[PDB]
Design a protein around this motif. Structure first.
Motif, mmCIF file in Angstrom:
data_model
loop_
_atom_site.group_PDB
_atom_site.id
_atom_site.type_symbol
_atom_site.label_atom_id
_atom_site.label_comp_id
_atom_site.label_asym_id
_atom_site.label_seq_id
_atom_site.Cartn_x
_atom_site.Cartn_y
_atom_site.Cartn_z
ATOM 1 N N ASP A 147 -20.066 -9.420 3.713
ATOM 2 C CA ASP A 147 -20.221 -9.860 5.096
ATOM 3 C C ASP A 147 -18.990 -9.451 5.898
ATOM 4 O OD1 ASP A 147 -22.728 -11.668 5.037
ATOM 5 O OD2 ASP A 147 -21.561 -12.296 3.285
ATOM 6 N N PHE A 148 -17.848 -9.422 5.220
ATOM 7 C CA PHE A 148 -16.584 -9.030 5.829
ATOM 8 C C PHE A 148 -15.821 -8.180 4.818
ATOM 9 C CE2 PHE A 148 -16.832 -11.753 9.526
ATOM 10 C CZ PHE A 148 -17.587 -12.847 9.109
ATOM 11 N N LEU A 149 -14.941 -7.329 5.324
ATOM 12 C CA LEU A 149 -14.161 -6.446 4.474
ATOM 13 C C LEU A 149 -12.727 -6.352 4.961
ATOM 14 C CD1 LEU A 149 -14.042 -4.135 2.278
ATOM 15 C CD2 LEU A 149 -14.638 -2.555 4.109
ATOM 16 N N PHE A 150 -11.791 -6.359 4.017
ATOM 17 C CA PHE A 150 -10.379 -6.212 4.327
ATOM 18 C C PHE A 150 -9.905 -4.970 3.583
ATOM 19 C CE2 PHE A 150 -9.779 -10.641 5.932
ATOM 20 C CZ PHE A 150 -8.953 -10.332 7.014
ATOM 21 N N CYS A 151 -9.125 -4.137 4.256
ATOM 22 C CA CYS A 151 -8.593 -2.925 3.647
ATOM 23 C C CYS A 151 -7.078 -3.122 3.609
ATOM 24 C CB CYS A 151 -8.989 -1.711 4.482
ATOM 25 S SG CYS A 151 -10.775 -1.610 4.830
ATOM 26 N N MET A 152 -6.490 -3.018 2.422
ATOM 27 C CA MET A 152 -5.058 -3.265 2.285
ATOM 28 C C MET A 152 -4.224 -2.294 1.466
ATOM 29 S SD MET A 152 -4.884 -7.344 1.642
ATOM 30 C CE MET A 152 -5.666 -8.550 2.708
ATOM 31 N N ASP A 153 -2.927 -2.264 1.771
ATOM 32 C CA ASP A 153 -1.959 -1.460 1.030
ATOM 33 C C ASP A 153 -1.809 -2.175 -0.313
ATOM 34 O OD1 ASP A 153 -1.497 0.095 3.312
ATOM 35 O OD2 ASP A 153 0.664 -0.050 3.114
ATOM 36 N N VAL A 154 -1.456 -1.441 -1.357
ATOM 37 C CA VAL A 154 -1.290 -2.056 -2.666
ATOM 38 C C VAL A 154 0.144 -2.557 -2.870
ATOM 39 C CG1 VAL A 154 -0.645 0.119 -3.768
ATOM 40 C CG2 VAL A 154 -1.597 -1.750 -5.145
ATOM 41 N N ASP A 155 1.080 -2.007 -2.099
ATOM 42 C CA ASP A 155 2.487 -2.369 -2.246
ATOM 43 C C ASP A 155 2.871 -3.658 -1.533
ATOM 44 O OD1 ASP A 155 2.147 -1.080 0.255
ATOM 45 O OD2 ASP A 155 4.319 -0.665 0.318
ATOM 46 N N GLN A 156 2.084 -4.691 -1.797
ATOM 47 C CA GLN A 156 2.301 -6.008 -1.228
ATOM 48 C C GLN A 156 1.755 -7.021 -2.227
ATOM 49 O OE1 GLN A 156 0.414 -5.781 2.588
ATOM 50 N NE2 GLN A 156 -1.624 -5.288 1.789
ATOM 51 N N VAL A 157 2.105 -8.291 -2.046
ATOM 52 C CA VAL A 157 1.688 -9.348 -2.962
ATOM 53 C C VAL A 157 1.293 -10.621 -2.226
ATOM 54 C CG1 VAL A 157 2.433 -10.831 -4.868
ATOM 55 C CG2 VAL A 157 3.279 -8.484 -4.719
ATOM 56 N N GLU A 189 2.957 -13.816 9.196
ATOM 57 C CA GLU A 189 3.022 -14.684 8.021
ATOM 58 C C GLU A 189 2.050 -14.164 6.960
ATOM 59 O OE1 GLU A 189 1.978 -18.096 10.377
ATOM 60 O OE2 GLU A 189 3.834 -19.177 9.901
ATOM 61 N N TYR A 190 1.062 -13.396 7.417
ATOM 62 C CA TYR A 190 0.041 -12.811 6.552
ATOM 63 C C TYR A 190 0.442 -11.463 5.957
ATOM 64 C CZ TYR A 190 -3.200 -16.521 7.653
ATOM 65 O OH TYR A 190 -3.783 -17.772 7.713
ATOM 66 N N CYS A 191 1.644 -11.005 6.296
ATOM 67 C CA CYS A 191 2.159 -9.740 5.791
ATOM 68 C C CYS A 191 3.616 -9.682 6.234
ATOM 69 C CB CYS A 191 1.359 -8.570 6.376
ATOM 70 S SG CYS A 191 1.616 -6.997 5.510
ATOM 71 N N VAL A 233 4.523 -17.948 4.174
ATOM 72 C CA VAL A 233 4.117 -16.579 3.892
ATOM 73 C C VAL A 233 2.890 -16.566 2.982
ATOM 74 C CG1 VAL A 233 4.763 -14.393 2.826
ATOM 75 C CG2 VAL A 233 6.468 -15.688 4.116
ATOM 76 N N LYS A 234 1.887 -15.780 3.360
ATOM 77 C CA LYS A 234 0.673 -15.663 2.572
ATOM 78 C C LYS A 234 0.713 -14.353 1.787
ATOM 79 C CE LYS A 234 -0.384 -18.286 6.317
ATOM 80 N NZ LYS A 234 0.267 -19.435 5.630
ATOM 81 N N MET A 235 1.449 -13.381 2.321
ATOM 82 C CA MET A 235 1.583 -12.064 1.709
ATOM 83 C C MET A 235 2.910 -11.435 2.115
ATOM 84 S SD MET A 235 -0.482 -9.309 0.377
ATOM 85 C CE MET A 235 -1.961 -8.953 1.294
ATOM 86 N N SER A 236 3.525 -10.700 1.190
ATOM 87 C CA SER A 236 4.799 -10.047 1.474
ATOM 88 C C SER A 236 4.852 -8.608 0.970
ATOM 89 C CB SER A 236 5.950 -10.844 0.848
ATOM 90 O OG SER A 236 5.802 -10.927 -0.558
ATOM 91 N N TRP A 237 5.612 -7.782 1.683
ATOM 92 C CA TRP A 237 5.801 -6.381 1.328
ATOM 93 C C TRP A 237 6.519 -6.350 -0.019
ATOM 94 C CZ3 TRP A 237 8.106 -3.483 6.248
ATOM 95 C CH2 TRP A 237 7.377 -3.871 7.389
#
Ligand code: UDP
Ligand code: MN
Length: 284
Positions: free
Chosen positions: A138-148, A255-257, A271-275
């Motif tokens: 229903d929804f899609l997120f595209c992300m870099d792999v070099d994050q956590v 805060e999401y990246c 923080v929900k995700m970090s580089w």
């Protein structure tokens, strides 16, 4: 029927931008009622997809951490499908997925030049959306792999078209934004123009919207190649041009990246995700 007031409480974070001029919410920690959204989306039986590419050393360096954290924090309580594109399905890290998580791996052709690897994702994602993703989520997120993922990254981030506020420039004047400034490039954004500087590490929305995001960005990339030019920040420059012309219906706070290498200012509450790696802003 879902109302904006059912889950978004912008007044909770008065010191930051919680809504754009065009009325899209900017989601910050404390402004969202995830419980209400979880119940709402659960009743619709929605599924969320997440595409991530890992080519070359990136596999050994970041794929495992990205997936293990995603498994634990991404859209918890909802069906999630991880679409993993790698150039060597053999170096794939082996991890156990939890409830409501599953995955699909695809072996892709590796581009030799890293910038090309980054940009070609726009092409690949689009092909996959048409081929299968449009039928699966229903929804899609595209992300870099070099994050956590550091904490819960949930349904509060869902929207028709979703953009990520870049950690470095979220408080800057648009004229300091690192948009592509050459008129010869399809990503060109004139000085005196622009709303925000969006990070290409995270973007998403409905398959239809993401398809348009990726198709338009890739066309711009192709145009630039024939005009003997390449945008300063590649796919990210084109992404910013796209979001300028087609305003996102939701924006995620830094805060999401977040980039820990610039510290942790007052506005970053959770923080929900970090580089994963420190990156410079070189110009000379
Ligand atoms: O050799 C490469 C170069 C890029 N990527 C993918 O392309 C994304 C974008 O590249 P990069 O992260 O390095 O850009 P940055 O955030 O450092 O500016 C990465 O996160 C990976 O998913 C990859 O797999 N292998
Ligand atoms: Mn990255």
């Amino acid at each position: 029927k879902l109302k904006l007031s059912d889950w978004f409480n912008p007044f909770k974070r008065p010191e930051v931008v919680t809504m754009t001029k065009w009325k899209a919410p900017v989601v910050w920690e404390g402004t969202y009622n995830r419980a209400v959204l979880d119940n709402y989306y659960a009743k619709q039986k929605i599924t969320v997809g997440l595409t991530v590419f890992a080519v070359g050393r990136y596999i050994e360096h970041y794929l495992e951490e990205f997936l293990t954290s995603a498994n634990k924090h991404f859209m918890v309580g909802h069906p999630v499908i991880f679409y993993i594109m790698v150039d060597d399905v053999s170096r794939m890290p082996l991890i156990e997925l939890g409830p409501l998580r599953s995955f699909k791996v695809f072996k892709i052709k590796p581009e030799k030049r890293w910038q090309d690897i980054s940009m070609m994702r726009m092409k690949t994602i689009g092909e996959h959306i048409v081929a299968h993703i449009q039928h699966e989520v229903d929804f899609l997120f595209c992300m870099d792999v070099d994050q956590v993922f550091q904490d819960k990254f949930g349904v509060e981030t869902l929207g028709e078209s979703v953009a990520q506020l870049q950690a470095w420039w979220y408080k800057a004047d648009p004229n300091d934004f690192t948009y592509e400034r050459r008129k010869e490039s399809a990503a060109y954004i004139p000085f005196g123009e622009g709303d925000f500087y969006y990070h290409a590490a995270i973007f998403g929305g409905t398959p239809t919207q993401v398809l348009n995001i990726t198709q338009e960005c890739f066309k711009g990339i192709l145009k630039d190649k024939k005009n003997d030019i390449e945008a300063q920040w590649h796919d990210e420059s084109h992404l910013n041009k796209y979001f300028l012309l087609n305003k996102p219906t939701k924006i995620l706070s830094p805060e999401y990246c977040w980039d820990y290498h610039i510290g942790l200012p007052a506005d970053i509450k959770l923080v929900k995700m970090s580089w994963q790696t420190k990156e410079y802003n070189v110009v000379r």
